[PDB]
Enzyme design. Structure first.
Site, PDB file in Angstrom:
ATOM      1  N   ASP A   1       9.635 -22.103 -50.249  1.00  5.60           N
ATOM      2  CA  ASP A   1       8.767 -21.644 -51.313  1.00  5.60           C
ATOM      3  C   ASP A   1       8.675 -20.104 -51.306  1.00  5.60           C
ATOM      4  O   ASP A   1       9.389 -19.431 -50.551  1.00  5.60           O
ATOM      5  CB  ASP A   1       7.406 -22.367 -51.327  1.00  5.60           C
ATOM      6  CG  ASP A   1       6.422 -21.968 -50.259  1.00  5.60           C
ATOM      7  OD1 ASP A   1       6.810 -21.017 -49.451  1.00  5.60           O
ATOM      8  OD2 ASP A   1       5.340 -22.478 -50.155  1.00  5.60           O
TER       9      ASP A   1
ATOM     10  N   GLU B   1       5.724 -24.790 -60.869  1.00  5.78           N
ATOM     11  CA  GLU B   1       6.399 -25.086 -59.609  1.00  5.78           C
ATOM     12  C   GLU B   1       7.887 -25.396 -59.724  1.00  5.78           C
ATOM     13  O   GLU B   1       8.589 -25.246 -58.739  1.00  5.78           O
ATOM     14  CB  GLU B   1       5.722 -26.268 -58.891  1.00  5.78           C
ATOM     15  CG  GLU B   1       4.254 -25.997 -58.649  1.00  5.78           C
ATOM     16  CD  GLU B   1       3.963 -25.063 -57.494  1.00  5.78           C
ATOM     17  OE1 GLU B   1       5.010 -24.688 -56.791  1.00  5.78           O
ATOM     18  OE2 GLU B   1       2.849 -24.681 -57.255  1.00  5.78           O
TER      19      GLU B   1
END
Ligand SMILES: [Cl-]
Ligand SMILES: [Cl-]
Length: 162
Positions: A20, A11
């Site tokens: 994202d 991440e």
């Protein structure tokens, strides 16, 4: 290696609100804020999560706290899920981390839908599961990450992360 370090690699860490891979507002270590197109809505969710007027920015400690909360929630979700729990219980420690990673990224529901793969994992049919896992939108949209998780299920080692 462990679940935290694994997810930190997958991440990354960003201290300002960002979008994202799917274009949703997120912060820190993959902490989704909202699926809403509104930056303000995102700033509002951030403030509510941290408990202060952040102005779209978090500190490192704050991001890490959200991360601890999210990992804990992922595990707890798996354990409460009737389709997930039995798989998790059947796996070794390394593979368990792979399953947590998937839940962290796509949610309980998302993963619980990989019916066929779950059965294969439960059966310990590694190579077959890996093939089935790859026939998914998940793999096609985020192939490098998916390959890492898949290899992890296939081998039961952390080789993909070293
Ligand atoms: Cl939260
Ligand atoms: Cl990727």
């Amino acid at each position: 290696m462990n679940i935290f370090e694994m997810l930190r690699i997958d991440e990354g860490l960003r201290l300002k609100i960002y979008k994202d891979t799917e274009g949703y507002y997120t912060i820190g270590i993959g902490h989704l804020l909202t699926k809403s197109p509104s930056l303000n809505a995102a700033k509002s969710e951030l403030d509510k999560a941290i408990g202060r007027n952040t102005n779209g920015v978090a500190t490192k400690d704050e991001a890490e706290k959200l991360f601890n909360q999210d990992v804990d929630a992922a595990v707890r979700g798996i354990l409460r899920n009737a389709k997930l729990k039995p798989v998790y219980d059947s796996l070794d420690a390394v593979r368990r981390a792979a399953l947590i990673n998937m839940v962290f990224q796509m949610g309980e529901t998302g993963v619980a839908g990989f019916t066929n793969s779950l059965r294969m994992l439960q059966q310990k049919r590694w190579d077959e599961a890996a093939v089935n896992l790859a026939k998914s939108r998940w793999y096609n949209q985020t192939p490098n990450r998916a390959k890492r998780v898949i290899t992890t299920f296939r081998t039961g080692t952390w080789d993909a992360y070293k």
